[PDB]
Design an enzyme around this catalytic site. Structure first.
Site, short mmCIF file in Angstrom:
data_model
loop_
_atom_site.label_atom_id
_atom_site.label_comp_id
_atom_site.label_asym_id
_atom_site.label_seq_id
_atom_site.Cartn_x
_atom_site.Cartn_y
_atom_site.Cartn_z
N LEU A 4 41.36 -27.80 60.13
CA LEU A 4 40.97 -28.77 61.14
C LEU A 4 41.46 -28.26 62.51
CD1 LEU A 4 40.28 -31.80 62.03
CD2 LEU A 4 42.57 -32.47 61.23
N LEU A 19 48.20 -27.66 74.05
CA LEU A 19 46.80 -27.72 74.07
C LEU A 19 46.51 -27.38 75.57
CD1 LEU A 19 45.96 -30.67 72.09
CD2 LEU A 19 45.84 -28.49 71.21
N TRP A 21 43.81 -28.56 77.10
CA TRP A 21 43.02 -29.70 77.56
C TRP A 21 43.87 -30.91 77.09
CZ3 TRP A 21 40.62 -26.17 74.33
CH2 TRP A 21 40.85 -26.49 72.97
N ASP A 26 39.41 -36.86 70.60
CA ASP A 26 39.66 -35.81 69.52
C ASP A 26 40.91 -36.07 68.80
OD1 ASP A 26 41.15 -32.74 69.25
OD2 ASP A 26 39.27 -33.03 68.14
N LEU A 27 42.00 -36.52 69.50
CA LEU A 27 43.28 -36.91 68.90
C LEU A 27 42.98 -38.17 68.01
CD1 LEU A 27 45.90 -36.54 71.96
CD2 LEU A 27 45.35 -34.85 70.23
N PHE A 30 41.54 -36.51 64.95
CA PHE A 30 42.63 -35.84 64.18
C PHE A 30 43.37 -36.79 63.19
CE2 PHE A 30 45.81 -32.55 63.58
CZ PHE A 30 46.96 -33.37 63.52
N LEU A 54 54.51 -37.02 62.20
CA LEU A 54 53.35 -37.85 62.59
C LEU A 54 53.38 -38.75 61.31
CD1 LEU A 54 50.53 -35.64 64.04
CD2 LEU A 54 51.97 -37.27 65.26
N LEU A 94 44.46 -31.39 50.92
CA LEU A 94 45.23 -30.53 51.78
C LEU A 94 44.32 -30.06 53.07
CD1 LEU A 94 47.76 -28.82 51.65
CD2 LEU A 94 46.46 -26.94 50.45
N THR A 116 36.11 -29.16 66.19
CA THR A 116 35.61 -29.89 67.33
C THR A 116 35.35 -28.71 68.36
OG1 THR A 116 37.25 -31.65 66.99
CG2 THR A 116 36.19 -31.68 69.18
N1 NDP Z 1 43.33 -26.64 69.52
C1 NDP Z 1 43.91 -26.98 68.34
O1 NDP Z 1 43.25 -27.47 67.32
C2 NDP Z 1 45.10 -26.46 67.72
C3 NDP Z 1 45.88 -26.02 68.63
N2 NDP Z 1 47.06 -25.43 68.45
C4 NDP Z 1 47.85 -24.49 69.37
O2 NDP Z 1 48.16 -23.24 68.80
C5 NDP Z 1 49.42 -22.68 69.39
C6 NDP Z 1 50.43 -22.66 68.22
O3 NDP Z 1 49.97 -21.48 67.40
P1 NDP Z 1 50.89 -20.23 66.86
O4 NDP Z 1 51.60 -19.92 68.17
O5 NDP Z 1 50.07 -19.39 66.03
O6 NDP Z 1 51.93 -21.17 66.06
P2 NDP Z 1 51.95 -21.87 64.63
O7 NDP Z 1 51.82 -23.31 64.92
O8 NDP Z 1 50.96 -21.28 63.69
O9 NDP Z 1 53.54 -21.60 64.27
C7 NDP Z 1 54.07 -20.24 63.89
C8 NDP Z 1 55.49 -20.47 63.20
O10 NDP Z 1 55.08 -20.70 61.97
C9 NDP Z 1 56.01 -20.17 60.95
N3 NDP Z 1 55.27 -19.30 60.11
C10 NDP Z 1 54.15 -18.58 60.30
N4 NDP Z 1 53.54 -18.04 59.33
C11 NDP Z 1 54.53 -18.21 58.30
C12 NDP Z 1 54.46 -17.87 56.77
N5 NDP Z 1 53.43 -17.20 56.23
N6 NDP Z 1 55.43 -18.42 56.18
C13 NDP Z 1 56.35 -19.25 56.83
N7 NDP Z 1 56.60 -19.56 58.13
C14 NDP Z 1 55.44 -19.10 58.79
C15 NDP Z 1 56.98 -19.45 61.84
O11 NDP Z 1 58.00 -20.32 62.33
P3 NDP Z 1 59.61 -19.95 62.62
O12 NDP Z 1 59.42 -19.25 64.02
O13 NDP Z 1 60.17 -21.36 62.83
O14 NDP Z 1 59.84 -18.90 61.54
C16 NDP Z 1 56.11 -19.01 63.10
O15 NDP Z 1 56.75 -18.89 64.43
C17 NDP Z 1 49.87 -23.72 70.43
O16 NDP Z 1 49.35 -23.48 71.73
C18 NDP Z 1 49.20 -24.98 69.88
O17 NDP Z 1 49.05 -25.96 70.94
C19 NDP Z 1 47.81 -25.67 67.23
C20 NDP Z 1 47.12 -26.38 66.25
C21 NDP Z 1 45.76 -26.82 66.43
C1 MTX Z 2 49.26 -30.50 69.75
N1 MTX Z 2 48.58 -31.23 68.60
C2 MTX Z 2 47.88 -30.36 67.78
C3 MTX Z 2 46.41 -30.80 67.63
C4 MTX Z 2 45.60 -31.42 68.58
N2 MTX Z 2 44.43 -31.72 68.55
C5 MTX Z 2 43.80 -31.24 67.42
N3 MTX Z 2 42.49 -31.60 67.29
C6 MTX Z 2 41.84 -31.19 66.12
N4 MTX Z 2 40.53 -31.57 66.00
N5 MTX Z 2 42.47 -30.43 65.20
C7 MTX Z 2 43.78 -30.05 65.21
N6 MTX Z 2 44.37 -29.36 64.27
C8 MTX Z 2 44.50 -30.54 66.40
N7 MTX Z 2 45.83 -30.32 66.52
C9 MTX Z 2 48.81 -32.57 68.55
C10 MTX Z 2 49.40 -33.43 69.69
C11 MTX Z 2 49.38 -34.73 69.33
C12 MTX Z 2 49.00 -35.35 68.14
C13 MTX Z 2 49.06 -36.65 68.17
O1 MTX Z 2 49.59 -37.51 68.86
N8 MTX Z 2 48.30 -37.50 67.53
C14 MTX Z 2 48.25 -38.77 67.03
C15 MTX Z 2 47.17 -39.86 67.38
C16 MTX Z 2 47.12 -40.44 68.74
C17 MTX Z 2 45.91 -40.80 69.83
O2 MTX Z 2 45.24 -41.23 68.77
O3 MTX Z 2 46.10 -40.90 71.18
C18 MTX Z 2 48.09 -38.76 65.51
O4 MTX Z 2 48.56 -39.96 65.04
O5 MTX Z 2 47.49 -38.05 64.72
C19 MTX Z 2 48.31 -34.57 67.19
C20 MTX Z 2 48.31 -33.29 67.35
#
Ligand code: NDP
Ligand code: MTX
EC number: 1.5.1.3
Length: 162
Positions: A4, A19, A21, A26-27, A30, A54, A94, A116
Site C-alpha cells: 500500500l 511525505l 505532500w 489519502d490518509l 490508508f 497507529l 498482511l 494512490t
Molecule cells: N508515499 C508513501 O506511501 C510512503 C512513503 N514513505 C516514505 O519513505 C521514506 C522511508 O523509506 P526508507 O527510508 O526506505 O525507510 P523504511 O521505512 O523502509 O525503514 C528502513 C529501516 O528499516 C529497517 N530494515 C530494513 N530492511 C530490513 C530487513 N530486511 N530486516 C530488518 N530491518 C530492516 C532498518 O531499521 P534500523 O535502521 O532501525 O535497523 C532500516 O533503516 C520516508 O520519506 C517516508 O516518508 C514511507 C511509507 C509509505
Molecule cells: C508518513 N505516513 C506514511 C504513509 C502515508 N500515506 C500513505 N498513503 C498510502 N496510500 N499508503 C501508505 N503506505 C502511506 N503511508 C503516515 C503519516 C500518518 C499516518 C496517519 O496519521 N494516519 C492516520 C489517519 C488520519 C487522517 O485520517 O487524518 C491513520 O489512522 O491511519 C499514516 C501514515
C-alpha cells in the site's frame, strides 16, 4: 499480501524522512485499508507516524536494532519473523506499508498493489521500487479531484495474474 503506497507521477514516495505532500483524503484511505490488518512498516516510516502505535491495527516494525523499543507494536528483525507472526494470525491480512527498503524486502511475496497515484510532481529523495506492472491487472480505479491540481489522485487496486 498487499503493498500500500501513494506516489506522484514519477514514482516519488518520500522526502527527508517524511511525505513530500500533505493529502488528507489519502490518509483517511490508508486508515480504511489498514484498520484491522497486520500492518508492516520499516523503523524509519514508523518513527514518522504522528501517534505510534497507529491504533486499531497490528503495527509490526521491522528494525536491525536488537534493543529497539516500541510499546504496543510487534518489533521483529527479519522477514521470516514477519511471516511467522502472520502464520499465527490467520484471519488478519498482511499489508506492507513501506518505505522503500521494506518494499524491497517483500518484493517477491506481494499479490496486490493498493497504489494512490498523484497527478503532480513533487521534489524528494525516495521513489517506489521497480515492479513488473505487466504481471498484474488494474481491477479498480477511482479518481478524486483536489483544488491543488498536483493533489488530484487516483486509487488503483492491482491483482497479480495466474
Ligand atoms: N508515499 C508513501 O506511501 C510512503 C512513503 N514513505 C516514505 O519513505 C521514506 C522511508 O523509506 P526508507 O527510508 O526506505 O525507510 P523504511 O521505512 O523502509 O525503514 C528502513 C529501516 O528499516 C529497517 N530494515 C530494513 N530492511 C530490513 C530487513 N530486511 N530486516 C530488518 N530491518 C530492516 C532498518 O531499521 P534500523 O535502521 O532501525 O535497523 C532500516 O533503516 C520516508 O520519506 C517516508 O516518508 C514511507 C511509507 C509509505
Ligand atoms: C508518513 N505516513 C506514511 C504513509 C502515508 N500515506 C500513505 N498513503 C498510502 N496510500 N499508503 C501508505 N503506505 C502511506 N503511508 C503516515 C503519516 C500518518 C499516518 C496517519 O496519521 N494516519 C492516520 C489517519 C488520519 C487522517 O485520517 O487524518 C491513520 O489512522 O491511519 C499514516 C501514515
Amino acid at each position: 499480501t498487499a503493498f500500500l503506497w501513494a506516489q506522484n507521477r514519477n514514482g516519488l514516495i518520500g522526502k527527508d524522512g517524511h511525505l513530500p505532500w500533505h493529502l488528507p483524503d489519502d490518509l483517511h484511505y490508508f486508515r480504511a485499508q489498514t484498520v484491522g490488518k497486520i500492518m508492516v512498516v520499516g523503523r524509519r516510516t514508523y518513527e514518522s507516524f504522528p501517534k505510534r502505535p497507529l491504533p486499531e491495527r497490528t503495527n509490526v516494525v521491522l528494525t536491525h536494532q536488537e534493543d529497539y523499543q516500541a510499546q504496543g507494536a510487534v518489533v521483529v528483525h527479519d522477514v521470516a519473523a514477519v511471516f511467522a507472526y502472520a502464520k499465527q494470525h490467520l484471519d488478519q491480512e498482511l499489508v506492507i506499508a513501506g518505505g522503500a527498503q521494506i518494499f524491497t524486502a517483500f518484493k517477491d511475496d506481494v499479490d496486490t498493489l493498493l497504489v494512490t497515484r498523484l497527478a503532480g510532481s513533487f521534489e524528494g529523495d525516495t521513489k517506489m521500487i521497480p515492479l513488473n506492472w505487466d504481471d498484474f491487472t488494474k481491477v479498480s480505479s477511482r479518481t478524486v479531484e483536489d483544488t491543488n491540481p498536483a493533489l488530484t489522485h487516483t486509487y488503483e487496486v492491482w491483482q497479480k495474474k495466474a
